[PDB]
């Protein structure tokens, strides 16, 4: 369409848009900043986010090296998922990020089938437990936004937000910067048709 | 504090302000165009795989939203007993019907140098690694015939682990159907941290 | 060695004479029926779910094989994002479509008396164990009202835990529909090392 | 009804009454002796691995509570990557010191006979049993020299399968110092569902 690649296109393809990828860095920037990411990397910041296409941590616009990114369905932050609770350890206890970011976005997939109960197979039932579960709990508020859908399944997406900085917040190495105060946690919000930012209250 | 668009010491505002020119830099190019398309809906091409290091992103494509769905953990390891992973790749290939799946490690990957020492690292960190633990015990010395250099053995490391993540990924249910109608394409890939080349892994 | 029918000692040929045993019994009871009947399938009407504990086992229960099936892991930890666990679920109920099924805890549980420590022990288990972590550290106070005997209070953890175990298992998306169907049953239990008795766990009603 | 103990249509009571009569038949022959050992800790002998399957069990080896240790999942399946096999391994070796473990596949296991199709299973049931529809690819010319009796062909993957199990197990951390000590054993069985009878299964050397 409108996008840089196709269903159609090459790895020539990707690999020009690579390329190009380069080239910008080089020209604002020289050799600057691949010579520091071939160093180390010193990220600012850890952002939680859903795997989907359009929202992402692009719309921060920052270099290479200074944001760890972690991305599943529905930015779902679970104390048995050992994929997340990795990334938070190394994030806090390595990498030493001062602000760790969990964003939720519009149109959400997962939070989506999570209002409208219809089994979605294979292990995305399961994977979505948490936020059915949160549905649940928050069931006469949902309904208070019952009268238009977009905005249920917005609330729906800030409670889930909401719902995985406080089990970021409950993580051991978390927990700990925390409370020396090292570290700051932010619920964010991503506008699908906007392209705007916004924070979740906490 | 850097020559980086954000130090640690940004505010929320400062944030903001970088989303402000993402929004703008996509509108100067692109008008209303992709935020209508993005608004009604996702359509990518693609799935990425890759770690979830500040350097090694998706970005290194220079794709717009709406182009790409993406996963990213440490080391870029893809397990069947990973729920995370596998959901994934299960609602990508089903649901979202992309096209390409792009598995990609990097250099200088710190899950792959830890897999190389001594050291416990510590926590639930250790065991996330197992997996590439195994694949460098299962592969000979092969990993030093260049104990003469660090790098090239952790290089080496970093595209067996690729290869690992491929094939358990052409193994998931979705993925193996998908691939036997010839209706996906599968790459693992290597990002040169140095040098921003991406480049291709040979799948056996 | 001594009072048990096997020890450490034992060879392959003593544990196929205890097998011949367990044939012989079984058909000297039932005749030939059992066998023939676990040939041709199985068509079991319990879903047991426990600790692997070597006392704590469904034989508790005194069935015949072809009437339960097991899973046991350590702390009988159910827990939505474990394959295995999850697995057994859908299966029983789906394919098997067991009537009844039962989480298991008991006393002197080792994942327990682990959980109820700070000490760290090593490998996959304080990951494993997490879950059990967890509702210690969410129930502390409850807990802690049970200083005056470790025993009662690692019994109490042990209780919660299958509660906890047995609420995951009804949000099962297989279960949750088989529940409200009124086509399945759903049991909280306890076992008593010392006694081998086996006793009902309270389990919280619908709140959600 | 049923010839079996216990019906779909049972009781609780009728549960608690089984179990009381697990518990005087007990006492009957060993007196107090079991369940106060029981009462104070366990030190079983052996690990068993084996099926879910209600026919299956490691009640085939007719043992009294405090001998063996017990994990049981779909299909009997030990993978370094799955969590609740590697710890009950790993408490049985390094807390328990068990002297044998006993990988039990058995005959009719749904798990290898769904192995044998590839026709997807949906839910986790797919992912779970990948390691054995694995093990049927790297043996396809030979079980399908068994294609004329199905039952015989999903005997051959059952055993296939506590091969791989039994040869994963051992590659555990645990097991492979304790069998480089000579300080434990390793069988793997099969179950025969038809017949109550266990064999043991010859594992490589
Ligand atoms: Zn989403
Ligand atoms: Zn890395
Ligand atoms: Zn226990
Ligand atoms: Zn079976």
Request: proline share 3%.
């Amino acid at each position: 369409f409108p996008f840089t690649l196709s269903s159609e296109s090459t790895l020539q393809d990707f690999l020009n848009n690579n390329k190009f990828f380069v080239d910008s860095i080089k020209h604002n920037h020289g050799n600057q900043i691949f010579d520091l990411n071939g160093q180390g990397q010193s990220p600012h910041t850890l952002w939680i986010g859903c795997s989907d296409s359009r929202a992402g941590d692009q719309c921060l616009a920052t270099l290479p090296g200074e944001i760890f990114v972690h991305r599943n369905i529905a930015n779902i932050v679970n104390a048995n998922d050992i994929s997340s609770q990795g990334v938070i350890q190394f994030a806090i206890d390595v990498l030493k990020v001062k602000k760790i970011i969990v964003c939720g976005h519009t149109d959400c997939g997962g939070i989506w089938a999570s209002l409208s109960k219809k089994k979605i197979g294979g292990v995305l039932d399961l994977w979505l437990n948490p936020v059915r579960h949160i549905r649940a709990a928050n069931l006469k508020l949902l309904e208070e936004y019952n009268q238009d859908p977009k905005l249920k399944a917005k609330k729906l997406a800030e409670l889930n937000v909401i719902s995985s900085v406080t089990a970021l917040k409950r993580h051991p190495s978390a927990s700990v910067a925390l409370k020396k105060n090292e570290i700051e946690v932010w619920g964010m919000l991503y506008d699908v048709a906007t392209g705007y930012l916004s924070q979740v209250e906490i």
